[PDB]
């Protein structure tokens, strides 16, 4: 049994805020990232760590997509484009998830069932790495 705390919804705004005193030789020093989330019957504006920005750029998240933010680690991911953004464009063939229900903040208690052989073959098979 486990408790998962998550943030999700359509992206309304995404602005990396500039710092008060930038450092020389660098472009765009960031002090925090303002992300606005919107879902069914809910809208909340978040303040994030500055180091979420390269994970945002890695996932190529734009305005109007649906994201999935873990609480403790950040670690955003693009679930897909919002289904309200299908009709403005004639040929846009990304997937179109519906707008998620409930609030953007939720504590769901999940229960996962595994066998000992699954743990054995997960630990023996080496984890997702970058070596050839």
């Amino acid at each position: 049994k486990e408790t998962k705390e998550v943030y999700e919804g359509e992206v309304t705004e995404l602005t990396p805020e500039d710092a008060e005193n930038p450092l020389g030789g660098y472009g765009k020093t960031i002090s925090h990232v303002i992300v606005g989330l919107k879902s069914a019957k809910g809208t909340k504006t978040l303040r994030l760590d500055p180091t979420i920005y390269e994970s945002i750029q890695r996932e190529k998240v734009s305005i109007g997509d649906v994201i999935y933010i873990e609480a403790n680690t950040g670690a955003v991911k693009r679930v897909g484009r919002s289904d309200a953004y299908a009709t403005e464009f004639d040929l846009e063939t990304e997937e179109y998830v519906p707008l998620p229900k409930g609030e953007v903040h939720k504590k769901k208690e999940i229960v996962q069932d595994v066998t000992l052989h699954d743990l054995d073959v997960a630990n023996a098979r080496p984890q997702g790495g970058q070596d050839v």
Binding site: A19, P22, L23, Y26, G27, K28, T29, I30, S31, H32, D49, P50, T51, Y53, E54
Partner: peptide, 12 residues
């Protein structure tokens, strides 16, 4: 990546 007591910075 810079980290003080009161604010965090990210000079990219």
């Amino acid at each position: 990546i810079l980290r003080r007591y009161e604010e965090d910075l990210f000079c990219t």
